[PDB]
Amino acid sequence: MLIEIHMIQNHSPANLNRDDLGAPKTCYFGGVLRSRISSQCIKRSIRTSNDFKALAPDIALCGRMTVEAALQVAHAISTHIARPEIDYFVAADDVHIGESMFASACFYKYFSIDWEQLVKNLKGDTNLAAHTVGAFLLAAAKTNPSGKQNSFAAHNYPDGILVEFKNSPISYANAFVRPVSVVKESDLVEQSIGQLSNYVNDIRLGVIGFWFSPNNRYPLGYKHSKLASRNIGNLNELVGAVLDYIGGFKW
Amino acid sequence: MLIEIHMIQNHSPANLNRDDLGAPKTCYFGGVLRSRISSQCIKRSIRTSNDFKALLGGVRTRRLADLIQQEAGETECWKKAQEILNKCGFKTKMLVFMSKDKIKDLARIVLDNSLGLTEAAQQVANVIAQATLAPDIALCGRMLEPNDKDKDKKVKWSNTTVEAALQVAHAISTHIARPEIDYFVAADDVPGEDAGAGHIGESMFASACFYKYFSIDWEQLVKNLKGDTNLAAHTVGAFLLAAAKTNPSGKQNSFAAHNYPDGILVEFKNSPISYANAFVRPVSVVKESDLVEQSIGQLSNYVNDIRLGYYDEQSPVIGFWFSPNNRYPLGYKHSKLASRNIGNLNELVGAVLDYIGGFKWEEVQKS
Amino acid sequence: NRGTVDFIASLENLKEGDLGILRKLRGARLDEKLPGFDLFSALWWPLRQKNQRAPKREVAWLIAKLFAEFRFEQREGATLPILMGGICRKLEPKKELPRVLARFDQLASLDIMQMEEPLSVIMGILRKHQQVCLDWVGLTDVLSFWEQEPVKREWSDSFIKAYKI
Amino acid sequence: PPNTLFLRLEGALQSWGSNEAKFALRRTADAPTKSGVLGLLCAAMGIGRAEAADSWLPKLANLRMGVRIDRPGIRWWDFHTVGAGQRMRMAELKAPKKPSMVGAALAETLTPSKVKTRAETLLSRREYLADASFLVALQGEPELVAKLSAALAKPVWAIYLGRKSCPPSRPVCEHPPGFYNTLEEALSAVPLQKRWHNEPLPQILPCVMDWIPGYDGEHAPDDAEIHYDLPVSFQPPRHLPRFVIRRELVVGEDVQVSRETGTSVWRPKGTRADYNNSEYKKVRAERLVMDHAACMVCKAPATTVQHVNYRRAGGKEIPEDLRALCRLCHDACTMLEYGSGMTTNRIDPCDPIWRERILAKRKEIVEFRSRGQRFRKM
RNA sequence: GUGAACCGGAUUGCCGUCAGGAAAUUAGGUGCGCUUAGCAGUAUUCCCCACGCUGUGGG
Ligand SMILES: [Mg+2]
Fold first, then answer.
1. DSSP string of B231-269?
2. What are the backbone dihedrals phi and psi of residue B221, each rounded to the nearest 5 degrees, phi first?
3. Neighboring chain B residues of C95 at a CB cutoff of 8 Å
4. DSSP D326-338
5. How many angstroms is it from D366 CA to the middle of ligand 1?
6. For residue A232, which of A217, A244, A221, A243 has the smallest C-alpha distance?
7. DSSP for D83-135, written as a single string
8. Which domain of life is it from (chain C) (predicted)?
């Protein structure tokens, strides 16, 4: 089976990944330019982290040198149009104007885990695989790239997570073909979550899933619809529910 | 552990930080325009404040030759200083950040000695590299990169990297930005034919309510200052006091925006969390309440959501909420989010020092 | 759209005393003064009963106060970004044009509760140049949906198209 | 029985490498490669790299291949770094004393400490196609087509779009297999799908096909190109050349256009209930009946209805969000919400926390309202 | 299990010091809101129950 994780996360003005010219990385989608965070940054951000340090694990999930890793991380994409900005700075002497680039955007992240590959890499152990899945979920929920963080303390937390158990891999990037336009009676994160909701309201009409928002701040579906099997307001409870569905293990 | 400071501050119409064109800085957040105050401006304002002068033991300058010359009564030590620094690798001149006493004494004694230029340059480089004992250097870090293109090939450099122990984010407004333009005309004292229609000028100013975020790592601060511990507590207390009661010196002679923060929240955690997402939706003023109260209410709502969300029983967090004379409570309706609500800044500093360790502010004011 | 045309027609049917009552209420809210509340209710409530897409209370109040102060003649095709933009072709490009343009452009950073004074100065600039006609229905329609980007884009594009002629 | 199977390749980013990538510069081809598609099928079925070369790649090599470019992406470049803050492995080894032993004999003596590393940072630039869609049709035996479709229904391993950081945006098995005689008919059978109502749509769709030999001999034409993408092995990689032709299909006569079939913009819910709908009058009359025609503040005869909340508007209205009120209390409540931004939840007259305010407002009316102004309606 | 897998562009920085939009202006000239009416000397007072061939009691 395959476990798919979708995350929606808003970040404060920062520069978490830049190119050789110092500008934030970008991509092209929906006929517009969007902000991008590289996959090999989110990986090595989740990896090599102190929090994640909780049959050798950390290699079965992410391989090294025919290990056949069981974790797949995609490229983070923005739900709106990119808005790069330039900051003009000078250096004092206490005894020449330079420019830097920064941006702020809301990102959609996609992760996939193959359960059978994880079990086979662990040589039949099944409790260790569940512990690794829980640890990876906790680490991915509470980790950010260590870019220009000393000048841009961007330590925001995700505002919505969806865990799915589909038969085939598929990403919901097509829910963001039209860039999000902010209206007075809503905000950016709410509109992004509504756009996501109006992509699983379809498809089924024309599997199960667990939805998590902090203290039920943003509920999936702008109605009393059953598009989500369970709505959970705690991260540990979400981990426990996923652990139970994996085959009934205790966190 | 990690000390997290959050502030809500409303400022009078002023221009504290301005760009090349002479306009207040702005940014995009939540899809809307917000006013911005840069992090380096805040760090510089705190560094050169009256509440931090007892710990200002570092200088960042490119005119090191003048400082070396000033450590001499009548000896001529200017051209040789420039030559030695050029062989060092500082050939536009590179900015050097390090302690004052070390550079003064050691550069004076080594430079004035009758030794070879290469050996003197090597000793100067070693002294510069090893001079990383100052609270400001520990707080802000250091990155020195000698130019290998025009430096003597005989000299060799050592480690000159100091990892920072302080993280400061750009201040952003809780509402939409409203830039304003003021038109001025200069007058002449003596009457006469005068000019034509007059030269109307333009000055850009704005007023906004800012949210400020600071993060301090205690272990890294201790490691930077070696096994000393009281100095770290003194630095933390002085930094808190300076950040509480210091503002950038922009157009302050015409815009005296000396306002004080209305709400401070100090938390002790193990991982950094930012409450900026409390203001993704801009704050709109209605006929009831004011800007500060709505901002504090939104901040309290987001804090409650975060606390009732990502929560682990194995590592609970606590903090103190400070408002002047308890005029702006956090839990306006029922929630007791904070533990030890304090109505005095000095009491808050004492509580923070007490939680950090067995520290009294009077005792630590000696290092 | 029906609902705004009849509102503007009813506004144009008022006499001197009601216009003065609304004039003395400029810069004030709807609730503090009772005569203004009663007059606005009498003018507005049946329209809201009959038509569901009627303008909201705030926009209608703002438009009523502006009409009471300025009293322009309704004419289709005489919107603000055209008259302002045809006027802007007679000023000195170096000094006066940026000063007028900044005041015209400041409207994009304000909500419906703060759009009285800038519109007042814009309409005063219009009145200084002998302008006797304005499209009130179109202005109300734009102000109703001011929180949408395409509306502002069309506004600015109309301004530029009128100016470049 | 069907003889051809269809694959849809669509995503935000994808890459199909070309033969002109032998260094840190990795470029991509304009269309999906045969080797990449065969590798995707092998991964879906569950054959490893060392087993595909044995009687699984030759079988799939005989299939005819054709790709239709629905929409082409934009070429984008990514700056990649490897090994910063760590040490990279080098290939340097100590020369042997004699040439007698090398390879497997010397590999048995390899130790973890014999390897050598160096602190450095590897730099590279990699090419991707952004916002591209492709349709691939594979034609051959019916049993193989059925097996491939069954495997593609549920993949054994994760499948990507040339690089593991490129997950699909649409299901790969969206189009069921069918029976067709030529590749052109199979490619023209599948329609062309839009994403939103107003978007540019290509007038002509290019197609890249394998070149059928026809009769025995029949040397390749002058427009045929050589592509080095016939798989022979995957570990180590080995590719062979093939002949490829290009054609086109003009939309509107051989390829049809599908509708939107969905909603893109989310938008909030519906406020602004109607005062002329029959349901609203029915529920208002019922609510007035429940309250015994008595105001909820002053207990005077009631004539109006106040909406506590605006959860539903027009179509549905329960008689529980409404309260009965007289003229004065309704007017006071209206003037108490003009600029508060209550949106959904309005004033509830039963709540004591409002009472002291409401009466106060009422007083003002009784002090200032003129009955001659409500009469003579202006 | 795909020119594929293993894969961070990283570390450092105040745009600070300067400014009156000012001098002069009546919004004035003309106008009826007028014609009309008992809260009272009656000929069925909107509904229900009980006793009689009008009297009690409830709305
Ligand atoms: Mg009442």
1. HHHHHHHHHHHHHHT----SSTTT-------SEEEEEEE
2. -65, -40
3. 200
4. -HHHHHHHHHTST
5. 13
6. A217
7. -TTS-EE----PPPSSTT--THHHHTT--TTT--EE---EEEEEEEEEEEEEE
8. Bacteria
